[PDB]
Amino acid sequence: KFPRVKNWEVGSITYDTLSAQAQQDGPCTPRRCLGSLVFPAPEQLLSQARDFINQYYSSIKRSGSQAHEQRLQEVEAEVAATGTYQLRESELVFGAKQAWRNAPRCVGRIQWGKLQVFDARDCRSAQEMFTYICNHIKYATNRGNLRSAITVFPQRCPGRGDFRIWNSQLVRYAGYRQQDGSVRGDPANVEITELCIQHGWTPGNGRFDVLPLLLQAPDEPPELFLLPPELVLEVPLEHPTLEWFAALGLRWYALPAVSNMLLEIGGLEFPAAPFSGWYMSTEIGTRNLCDPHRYNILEDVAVCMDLDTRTTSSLWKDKAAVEINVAVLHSYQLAKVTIVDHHAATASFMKHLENEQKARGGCPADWAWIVPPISGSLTPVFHQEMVNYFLSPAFRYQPDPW
Amino acid sequence: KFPRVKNWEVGSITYDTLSAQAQQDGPCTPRRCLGSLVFPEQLLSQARDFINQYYSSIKRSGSQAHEQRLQEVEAEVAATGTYQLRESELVFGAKQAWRNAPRCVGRIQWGKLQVFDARDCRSAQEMFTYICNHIKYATNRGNLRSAITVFPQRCPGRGDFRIWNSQLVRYAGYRQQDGSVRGDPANVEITELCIQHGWTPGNGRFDVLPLLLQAPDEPPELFLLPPELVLEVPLEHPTLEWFAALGLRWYALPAVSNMLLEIGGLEFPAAPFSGWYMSTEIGTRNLCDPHRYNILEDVAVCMDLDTRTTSSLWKDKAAVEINVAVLHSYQLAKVTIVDHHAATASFMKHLENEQKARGGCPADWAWIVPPISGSLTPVFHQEMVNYFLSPAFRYQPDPW
Ligand code: HEM
Ligand code: HEM
Ligand SMILES: Cc1cc(N)nc(COc2cc(CCN3CC(F)C3)cc(F)c2F)c1
Ligand SMILES: Cc1cc(N)nc(COc2cc(CCN3CC(F)C3)cc(F)c2F)c1
Ligand SMILES: C[C@H](O)[C@H](O)[C@H]1CNc2nc(N)[nH]c(=O)c2N1
Ligand SMILES: C[C@H](O)[C@H](O)[C@H]1CNc2nc(N)[nH]c(=O)c2N1
Ligand SMILES: [Ca+2]
Ligand SMILES: [Cl-]
Ligand SMILES: [Cl-]
Ligand SMILES: [Gd]
Ligand SMILES: [Gd]
Ligand SMILES: [Zn+2]
Known part of the structure; x- marks a missing residue:
């Protein structure tokens, strides 16, 4: 059998059949789990390329067609003579969308089909x-x-940097x-x-x-x-009711655009491929503004809130952090910048999981990264057992x- | 072979050399990680190993009292099919099985545990x-x-x-x-x-x-x-006077009565243990989980929050005051209670001690990080390695 997964909120139980197609291997062994760690050639090229081409031709329901046969023989030949190959424009669009879809740590994947691909090859x-x-x-x-968007710059090739x-x-x-x-x-x-x-x-x-x-x-x-x-x-941060909050002079930018990961598609690798969507409010509020090693404003907010910061059993930290998240969401909604709070984010994610089960029989998900950094058990993905594994195409x- | 483990808030690195001695097998493979899942005559060799453990624990291994106990258990199993634990070994296995419990955040307390022999x-x-x-x-x-009572072990042929x-x-x-x-x-x-x-x-x-x-x-x-x-503790809030009227209450003693205890190949299907609560177990999981008392929306109604838009964060504002009411009510009633901030900072000190005593500490991140205010506690930022030592609870x- 495959891994049996369970939702603890509804009672339902699924099986992750997809996890069996995991090609590259992760950091865990039966002797110790490392799921919390932040950071864990022609014939391999041809088998990676072959699997991708099949994926593309599965997606458009043309598996086994003449064009599917022909594109495989085509790719086989360019690899035989150049050692590399080139993606068709439509393969490259399909690939980037699959790389997003395959990202275990992204809670926004309900959107994976609505992605604007800019070709810059x-x-x-x-x-x-x-x-x-x-x-x-x-x-x-x-x-x-x-x-959401991604600009794909030229692929790694032998000889050139x-x-x-x-x-x-x-x-x-x-x-x-x-x-x-x-x-x-x-x-x-x-x-x-x-x-x-x-x-x-x-x-x-x-x-x-x-x-x-x-x-x-x-x-x-x-x-x-x-x-x-x-x-x-940029969004100047203010609070719906705490008027002094604006005097803190807090700003955050509108657009979250990750520029330093590598996109890998059918064995080809793209070192430069910036992608972007919109923020979940807890990344700005909790993580970026309250992490002690980040802007770390949490104690100062609390003092201005006149919370007894002298004992944690007042839960001042949690009262201040909630308020910084209210301010972030309210300021984005004010400035008319798109943003999503961790309750809608995670409940749309539960909608993604259910579709992926229907579509592929599984969905790679990293629980520690999908659960938001405040109010975890308040959101539905907390009670969702998850299976983590590596699919290609992928961001790395x-x-x-x- | 020595997993590098990082603290991201501090920037400190340590290596877990203790994972190499992991007794059994977890659920994970190089292909797929299943940490998030809740439930994932050779008797002689388990018993041999636990005894070296025990005598090493007390600074007298391979010595005189060691080899006596060895050929003791051997003859016991050769004559019975099982063997009998000394009282002191029972006490020591009791504490080890707690200290090895990867999901428990209260392990800073593992030294002080009252074992009640009921075999x-x-x-x-x-x-x-x-x-x-x-x-x-x-x-x-x-x-x-803290305490555990040990009832008679499993033995062949018997109920x-x-x-x-x-x-x-x-x-x-x-x-x-x-x-x-x-x-x-x-x-x-x-x-x-x-x-x-x-x-x-x-x-x-x-x-x-x-x-x-x-x-x-x-x-x-x-x-x-x-x-x-x-x-039991009637629940009231330091400032919201309606809260008392909700009629909420919880009990004082978290005491688990359905797990099996394993010591040196011996298994005790009855051995209940008890400590005191972390506040978020009561306030967030038992009263606020959708499949438990599920009280969040009622408390929210009473605080006159806006409950038709998720972005007012009414669930969060409600949860906090529920947790604040738990902490106030236990303090008022002079019942031992610990808040997730104090708990998690104590668990860091346990990690850091255990790094020197044994070179690591099995820990299950999903169950160590509290279910409210995760990134606000320092265990959120601590990489963790989860493996199975023996003796253990199962x-x-x-x-x-
Ligand atoms: C459109 C709305 C989107 C939302 C709300 C969203 C949300 C998130 C969040 C909260 C994380 C965890 C981030 C962290 O805490 O470090 C994440 C990770 C990630 N996202 Fe998304 N994302 C969106 C769009 C995208 C797009 C458009 C792509 C690629 C095309 C993408 C790819 C990824 C990847 C690869 C990761 C993993 C990076 C890591 O491990 O830190 N996301 N996303
Ligand atoms: C005295 C203070 C203690 C505190 C604050 C504490 C707290 C906790 C918490 C919050 C959990 C996670 C809740 C859960 O499992 O869902 C847990 C789990 C656990 N604790 Fe502790 N606990 C304490 C004492 C003890 C004692 C006395 C023992 C045994 C002698 C013990 C062994 C365990 C075990 C075996 C589990 C979970 C087993 C599993 O789920 O796999 N703990 N504890
Ligand atoms: C497209 C998009 C939308 C959205 N809302 N958020 C993201 C953040 O993704 C990433 C975020 C980070 C930052 C590292 N993390 C640790 C810190 F706590 C944040 C790195 C990275 F490599 C990512 F990919 C991306
Ligand atoms: C002695 C002690 C003190 C303390 N404060 N908490 C505990 C928790 O005991 C357990 C509690 C549960 C319940 C399952 N989970 C769902 C809910 F969210 C908790 C399982 C389990 F396997 C345990 F071991 C024990
Ligand atoms: C050590 C720990 O795994 C690390 O801090 C992780 C935990 N889960 C996370 N989850 C998300 N979404 N983003 C993060 O940065 C982290 N950090
Ligand atoms: C599905 C998921 O594994 C499950 O909800 C886990 C997550 N972390 C937990 N953490 C604690 N302390 N107790 C729990 O019951 C759980 N449940
Ligand atoms: Ca060509
Ligand atoms: Cl960010
Ligand atoms: Cl409980
Ligand atoms: Gd005001
Ligand atoms: Gd009222
Ligand atoms: Zn794992």
Whole structure:
């Protein structure tokens, strides 16, 4: 039998048949589980390519057609003579959508079919590259009505270096390593901040300075491009009832755009392929503003709320953190920037799981990452047993280029 | 072979060298991770291994008292088919089985645990007497103390001592003719058993169930608990005066009565254990889970929150005040209670000690991180390795 999974809220029990098709292997063994750890050539090429082509031809219900036979023989031959192959434009669209769908740690996959694929595979420099990214940012932001998107730059090929985006996200706030060891700004970004300065960017001093982009064309040092201020939509944070909250001077950007993962499709690998959607409020509120190693505003909010911060059995931390999440959602709703709260996010996810069971008989999900970072057992995915495993196509972490 | 484990808030790295000695096999493979799932003569070799453990524990291994005990158990099994634990070994295996429990966040307490030897027990009324001493001793007027009572081990050819109740204190769950349930829905199966085995049903949301105790090769027997023995806490809020009127209450003693204990290849199908509650077990899981008392929307109504839009975070605002009411009510009543913040920071200190005592600590992240305010507690940011050491507590098939 396959793994029996159970919902503890309804009582229902499914079986994950899909997990059996897992090709690449993960970090657990029968002797110890490592599911909480953040970071765990022609014939392999041909078998990876073959499986993808079959997936494409399954999707459009043309399995076994003449075109399916022919595209396999086609791909077999280009690999035999070039050692590589090229994806058709429609295969590349299907692949990116499958990579999102396959991402165990994404709670937003109900959207996986509504994804706008920008082909940039004939990009030829860091300048053309920056251009493709401003077009992405412009399209996905859409003056606050967010639309998911991905720009696919050229594939890894033997002989040439990769395109790389050095920033982890397109929009990120500077993190200034202050002289006494602290940080003014986002501490997650002190490394990329240091690298930007060294490469010629003149920094500022705010807690919310937008970083410039370091873009790396093949075999070439990274280049510095500044984003146009009017392309970076930002939301000033205020509270529906706590009027002093606005004086804190808090801002966050509209667009979450992950720029440093690698997209892998039918064995081909795309080092640079920024994708974006919209935020879940708890990523801004709890994670980005309350993590102790992030902006870490939680105690200061609480004191202004006049909460007894001297004993945890008042649950001041939880009262303050709830209020920072109210402010985030209310400020996005105000500025008319798309955003979703962790209750709708996770209940749409439960709608994704049920479809995936019908569609594929399984859905790779990382429980520790799908459960939101506040109010876990309040949401429905808490009581949902989940099976984690690796499908291709896929987004993958990759080394920092430097 | 030595799993690197990181703390992301701090940036500290340690390696778990203890996972190499993992006795049994978990549910996971290189192909698929199943951590999230809730339920995932060679006797001589388990018993040999536990004894080296024990004598190493007390700084006198391979020595004189070691080899005596070895050829002791050997002859015991060769003459019987099982063997008998020394009292001190029983005490030590009791604490180890708690200390090895990967899902327990309270393991900072594993040193202080009162073991009650009841392996000289026969008859359900004898069971019932051992049990009420436990309850009395562990309640201790509200200053809770940790304890386990060990009933006679499994042995070949013979029946078994089973407590049919999942916990020693459990509220009744009456399936209604409208479909739903009055009381604790978790307990619909045990409550029907109590009626089927003689008990006269109450009809309240907090009717304490009787005890169905089973002695080898006889049916189980009803055993009602003296009401002065089951310390309960009426729930009220420090500032919301209506809250008291909701009539909520919970019990003082978390006491688990359905797990099996395993020591040196020996298995004890009855061995109940008890400590004190973490607040989020009461406030968030038992009162707020959709399939338990499910009180969130009622508390929210009373606070005049907006319940037709998820983004007002009414579920969160309600849950917090419910948890605040739990903490206030236990403190007011001088019953031991611990909040998830204090608990989780103590569990860090347990991880950090155990890193020096044994070089690691089996921990199940999904069950260590509390069900409210996850990322606000420091265990959220701690990578964890889950494996199975022995001795241990285990789940076991229901007796019927
Ligand atoms: C449209 C709305 C979307 C929402 C609400 C959403 C939500 C989320 C959240 C909350 C996470 C966990 C993030 C963290 O805490 O680090 C995540 C992870 C992830 N998302 Fe989504 N996402 C969306 C769109 C997308 C798109 C469009 C893609 C790719 C085309 C994508 C791919 C991924 C991947 C690969 C991860 C895993 C990264 C990691 O392990 O940190 N997501 N998503
Ligand atoms: C004294 C303070 C204690 C605290 C604060 C505490 C807290 C907790 C919590 C919150 C859990 C997770 C709830 C769950 O399992 O769903 C748990 C599980 C557990 N604890 Fe503790 N506990 C304490 C004492 C004990 C004692 C005295 C023992 C045994 C002698 C023990 C052994 C276990 C076991 C075996 C489990 C879960 C088994 C499983 O689900 O696989 N704990 N505890
Ligand atoms: C498209 C999209 C929409 C949305 N709402 N959120 C995301 C965040 O995804 C990622 C988020 C992070 C940040 C790392 N994490 C640890 C910290 F706590 C956040 C890395 C990464 F590699 C991701 F992919 C993406
Ligand atoms: C001694 C002690 C103290 C304390 N504070 N909590 C406990 C929890 O005991 C257990 C509780 C449960 C219940 C299952 N889960 C669903 C609900 F969410 C808890 C299972 C289990 F296997 C346990 F072991 C024990
Ligand atoms: C150590 C731990 O696994 C790590 O902090 C994880 C836990 N789960 C998470 N889940 C999400 N969605 N995002 C995260 O950053 C994390 N962090
Ligand atoms: C499906 C999932 O494994 C299940 O809800 C788990 C999650 N974490 C938990 N954590 C604790 N402490 N108790 C639980 O019952 C659970 N349940
Ligand atoms: Ca061609
Ligand atoms: Cl982010
Ligand atoms: Cl409980
Ligand atoms: Gd106000
Ligand atoms: Gd009122
Ligand atoms: Zn695992």
